[PDB]
């Protein structure tokens, strides 16, 4: 009578069912080019990433109050908030249990570190959003390093524990995770489900640039406070962003991060497949 | 790194709340057999209490409560996202704090015990929100997961550091059942009948449901999630009418009896028996 | 099928459980010493009247949007509106089936007449209540004669089909069925004075509106406020629309003892029931 | 007695707005066998039209629909109490009108068949509101009672006055399931958008998805919400198509239409009815 | 730290991002104040009007209150009213203040009648309509040209209607007046020519597009042609009237 | 021209409501020094009452209050758009009544004082709706602008017509803080219920709690909620009373009253005011 496993884990399965690009899985596969972890241990780590990542996504969609993910209704929108919260937390501790494999003294300590950081960054994003105090660009980046840096750290760090590779590539991880989120944040605004970021009231990187670039106007802060689903107000806001030059700013900064991206990978070896991933991901702005 | 102050605000708010935390008093009341080293004892109490309060932060979100120990729920002030993320944060603060015990098996126990907790919680939520009332055996068996987790972490982690070898998991079972059933009964028989508004199948409502299969009112009242005082009062009168409270009391006096017997099998306890006596005064 | 009835009749059984004054069945017991209907036919008649009546209250509870019925939550508050609507309609036709006993060619005819009369009365009351046009005292009395007179007429008339008694009592049923409604509506002694919250035109409310052509607004509000209801009680109290209806109950009821003569059994019910 | 006008205002309104009125074509197409006298036939058609329209007035309250045939629901303009009482009134007016056929068996048939209607309704409402999905067999039985009731009243009341001795209960059954399953499919495959999902009612396709994939309690949950959200409804249709429920509802529909086609030959055939079933069968082409 | 001024006036400036400055004979040197003071008074009146009219958009841009929130835009707008009076304390003229107050009271009277008819569900007549419009749009015109006239010895009460152009342009962001529930001149004329349904559709305050098309169908818009070229008191102004009148052609 | 009645209907409504004459009392007690001519004084009092009540019409909209002087807000019955126009109308009716004062400085002082009122109002609204708690000093300055404006119009306008030339700005300020803090504390402490919390505005008692214990963002969050829930309000007031914010507010109130007396006596004294301020301070005994 262990159908309770299937029922308890149902919101999670639903989310996986929706196509998820699993770019991070492509990454891990292309980061074994440096790591070359035994397949048996690599499969276990990859399981922990997909589990932890999608669990964090389940929780995020509640806390971010989004309506859609990968084009399909969010898990709490169908299964109800309590079920998907508990479901996602369950997947967290299934991940820890799965990490008790590998038999490595360092896996659990690394695990707690990485999840702690993910939760700190995630908590900061919501704190700024809900307490209506915008961060500086540095604060935004530094938190993003924790927010997207968390899972990246679990993946690549867990691979480092079982590799005869001893170097220190966390610089590549920082630069990379900043490329991912800022690609996403720019991608959200520069295009139903239109400008969902504005409805969250979240401080995207572009809104942060417009907010600090022109302290003479308060609007964007106010547009964010409203949390409007109204199409016209959001269209105006992207108009404002463009007039203050923020999408341009994000392009410049994005090409910045990509330029640095190629540098410390060049210094970290060849890595052709990963570079190909990077180009493909940068294709949006051109 | 003052940022923790911000992240831990909902958790801190809940801890400010006066709660006897009698689970601590059951760790130190279970300290009569275990005689755990103090240095390890205080750190264990920290991790068990931490995990407990995180669970409560989540329960009030999932259970959609309005009040806890007389004070507004954390999400009611700080918002749902803030309290969710803070509580999940405190989970891994607990995982981190357990590593100080330096026991190779401490992490294993922490994991299994949390998985049991999440199974119990999920099961309760599944039944209530999916409108399938359980059998009394499914209720007891589940409660052992929902309430058994924290208890098992306490005594179970203490067990690694105790020269005592005997098996208290029987005593724990009886304890968790006596605790949860105590709260369910206390919740319906004393804001007022909050469990009915949650729509959850407490023990008494379950007994009424299966005892008289002819009717389906109880299920229908529960499905509503009603705040109406008149309907709620009707449900308690019907509940008393079928004798669901007499049954709940009786099973409680049953558990208390098995309790006393159980401790006596393991040596005998002056303090804990006094504790359970105090709690059993509730249905005096 | 099996157990299909248990699910469908659950609201109905729920209403039947609730302690009931069962004044219709006693008021029909009274008409036995006149009719002396055979036990075999009488039991079926009492069953059918209780059935149709209890359904009528279920629909009334929806239409009036009452919050309490016999001190216990209304059936739709527990089982939900669709469920109790369909169940109640069900017992309506179960009543028709039950009248297929008695083996009387005319029984179904009387049944049909009395039920359509009921809805005519109920529908008129609902129309005035929801469209804010107060009726004349005559329109009210005639309507109540239809509304409660419907059920009375099925009981006593169907009883008349099986009785060796050939006098007429329709004037009695007139006075009595009007006396019941004016007694109940007249009641204003929590759920206190819900009739005003319904927005219904009570007899006292009708007397108050017509006595001073210068109450309709408080009724239109349909307010649950205790203060609005209490103030409304003041405008009634100074309108004196109370002892006029109470008087009219002493007139109507007083008229009944004389119209009965005859029943002592009905007489005791009339005096006792009139104590308010 | 102009008060009947006010009492019958909701019922008159429903009769006003367009409506398939196809059931009248069913009765006509069954008189090709029954060859009922006009004097009795017109009265039976009046009784079926009345009772049907009343049942729809109540059905909207029970189903919480917003619209009928493109027009506001009766209770949305006249209010719940007014329409409830009006429809019940026309119910018993139907009883009075059937008493004019002067057949001793008509009332017994009326009571029986109306009981059938209310049992089916009660079952549909029960499963929907108490969150218990029914089996495909339970559903089919319910449809035979709910949609079978009135159709059986029409054809059976016609049967009281016909020298025809053939049995038609089998084709009645096949037809009523053709109606309910056709309407359910047409409701979900498309009017409004998936109005059945907003009711939360267990239609034929949704139950197929429920039992076909005992893994996912998604469908139960989307109905449970009674969501008006376009995105949830649209996703649910996506699921229903990927599970197979739609090809399956079609299959049972083409089977049913075929079985319809055989039972008419079993009764010698009916040109108009064959045309009716073909025309209605164009829906799932 | 006098940034509280920027904080106070932001809704106003926001509207300024977004113009008709009719020129007038015998202009005085110091008239910049008339042009500026009228600009302020107009934009403030517009901020409040967008609150009162419940508009969603202005000049293709969100309304101020949709961004800054009703209270902020209200207080800002009143603030700029009194900045207009304060700047009017310039010119050092004893009669300037009196002319200012009088004309502003006229503006508020006209507006108040408009909102009252709309919110009280009573249709206005073409007579009462023209009279009110003279106050609503005429008000600001008076501070402008009268204050300018106090410095020209060229001692004109013409009061040409603009609002009728606005009314037609709204109904010929779709049918925004119909969604507002305001009585445009065409709906008033249509209601009075053939006495019901117009009053009923307007009462709805519907955002529904289909109802709007139905209302657009109903034949009084030809009456709304009107047309007036009654200037010729005695160059640029004629060009203004010509350019604006192209709407009906 | 009966239309004026309709234009002033909201204004007339608020004036109809029974009201405290405390500001009129304040002015009548400042005439002991001012000794304004009756004829000019009466017009001054009319204009002060007008502007005050109009400002109240706007404040109830901006604070989104539900009740004023125990009776529903005017916009709740007559509607927002109507009440704004009424109040703005009353502004310039007040100015126009000041033009009868026939003094070159009357209008200049008037504009100055109205601008200050709108400066304070704006600050309150900005902090509330942008969620920026102010410092105690920023609050006091703001109170001087918002509550100080009308008082300043009063005694300043009378000072234009009084041979009294002694500096009364300090006593005015002490009065302004005394009133506003008296009102805020009175709003949160005793006797619909904690309405300020539902507004989310930073009253003095709430600000002391916010800055006194920066370790917790509760009060900022409760204010952000704008909650009508009675339980949260009761918790929050308990929180203040535990953090000691009430006691702080009382102390600043009694200090203010003391400085008041000093500043009356040091101005030649007064009998009418000394009595008024004592009566007001009995409230926080
Ligand atoms: O922007 P978010 O952080 O919410 C997101 O990137 C999700 N997420 C969650 C944690 N890290 C990233 P998404 O925009 O996909 O909803
Ligand atoms: O009944 P719950 O599980 O919600 C409860 O017992 C909390 N809880 C949750 C897990 N263990 C205990 P509480 O009655 O305290 O609301
Ligand atoms: O006042 P009502 O008509 O509703 C009433 O008399 C019920 N009723 C309904 C129809 N006939 C009688 P009751 O007081 O029982 O609620
Ligand atoms: O879905 P229902 O069965 O209620 C329906 O088919 C009506 N109905 C009522 C009885 N039988 C059928 P409709 O879709 O028209 O609302
Ligand atoms: O409709 P209104 O008259 O209010 C308007 O013309 C503005 N207005 C306000 C006063 N006078 C003119 P607009 O249509 O631009 O919103
Ligand atoms: O709190 P406010 O500042 O709005 C107030 O004091 C009104 N007010 C506004 C300006 N001056 C005083 P009230 O509490 O009476 O609503
Ligand atoms: Mg996020
Ligand atoms: Mg997200
Ligand atoms: Mg994103
Ligand atoms: Mg729980
Ligand atoms: Mg709980
Ligand atoms: Mg409990
Ligand atoms: Mg009634
Ligand atoms: Mg009733
Ligand atoms: Mg009554
Ligand atoms: Mg339906
Ligand atoms: Mg239905
Ligand atoms: Mg259908
Ligand atoms: Mg306008
Ligand atoms: Mg306007
Ligand atoms: Mg216009
Ligand atoms: Mg206020
Ligand atoms: Mg204020
Ligand atoms: Mg105040």
UniProtKB/Swiss-Prot annotation, chain D:
InterPro entries: Isoprenoid_synthase_dom_sf, Polyprenyl_synt, Polyprenyl_synt_CS
Binding site for isopentenyl diphosphate: 20, 23, 52, 69
Tissue specificity comment: Abundantly expressed in testis. Found in other tissues to a lower extent. Expressed in dermal fibroblast and skeletal muscle.
Residues that bind dimethylallyl diphosphate: 68, 146-147, 180, 191, 201
Regulation (activators, inhibitors): Subject to product inhibition by geranylgeranyl diphosphate.
Pathway(s) per entry: Isoprenoid biosynthesis; farnesyl diphosphate biosynthesis; farnesyl diphosphate from geranyl diphosphate and isopentenyl diphosphate: step 1/1; Isoprenoid biosynthesis; geranyl diphosphate biosynthesis; geranyl diphosphate from dimethylallyl diphosphate and isopentenyl diphosphate: step 1/1; Isoprenoid biosynthesis; geranylgeranyl diphosphate biosynthesis; geranylgeranyl diphosphate from farnesyl diphosphate and isopentenyl diphosphate: step 1/1
Top-rank taxon, per record: Eukaryota
Name used for this protein in its record: Geranylgeranyl pyrophosphate synthase
Gene expressing this chain: GGPS1
């Amino acid at each position: 009578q262990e159908t309770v496993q299937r029922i308890l884990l149902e919101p999670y399965k639903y989310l996986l069912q929706l196509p998820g690009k699993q770019v991070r899985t492509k990454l891990s596969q292309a980061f074994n080019h440096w790591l070359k972890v035994p397949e048996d241990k690599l499969q276990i780590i990859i399981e922990v990433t997909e589990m932890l990542h999608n669990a964090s996504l389940l929780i995020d969609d509640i806390e971010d109050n989004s309506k859609l993910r990968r084009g399909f209704p969010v898990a709490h929108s169908i299964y109800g908030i309590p079920s998907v919260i508990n479901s996602a937390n369950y997947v967290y501790f299934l991940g820890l249990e799965k990490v008790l494999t590998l038999d490595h003294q360092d896996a659990v300590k690394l695990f707690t570190r990485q999840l702690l950081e993910l939760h700190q960054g995630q908590g900061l994003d919501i704190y700024w959003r809900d307490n209506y105090t915008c961060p500086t660009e540095e604060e935004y980046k530094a938190m993003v390093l924790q927010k997207t840096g968390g899972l990246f750290g679990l993946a690549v760090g867990l691979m480092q524990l079982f590799s005869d590779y001893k170097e220190d590539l966390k610089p590549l991880l920082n630069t990379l995770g900043l490329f991912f989120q800022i690609r996403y944040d720019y991608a959200n605004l520069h295009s139903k489900s239109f400008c969902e970021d504005l409805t969250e009231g979240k401080f995207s990187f572009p809104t942060i640039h417009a907010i600090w670039s022109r302290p003479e106007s308060t609007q964007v802060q106010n547009i964010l406070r409203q949390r409007t689903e109204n199409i016209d107000i959001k269209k105006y806001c992207v108009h404002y962003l463009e007039d203050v030059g923020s999408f341009e700013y994000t392009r410049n900064t994005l090409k910045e991060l990509e330029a640095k991206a190629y540098k410390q990978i060049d210094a970290r070896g060849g890595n052709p497949e990963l570079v190909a991933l990077v180009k493909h991901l940068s294709k949006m702005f051109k």
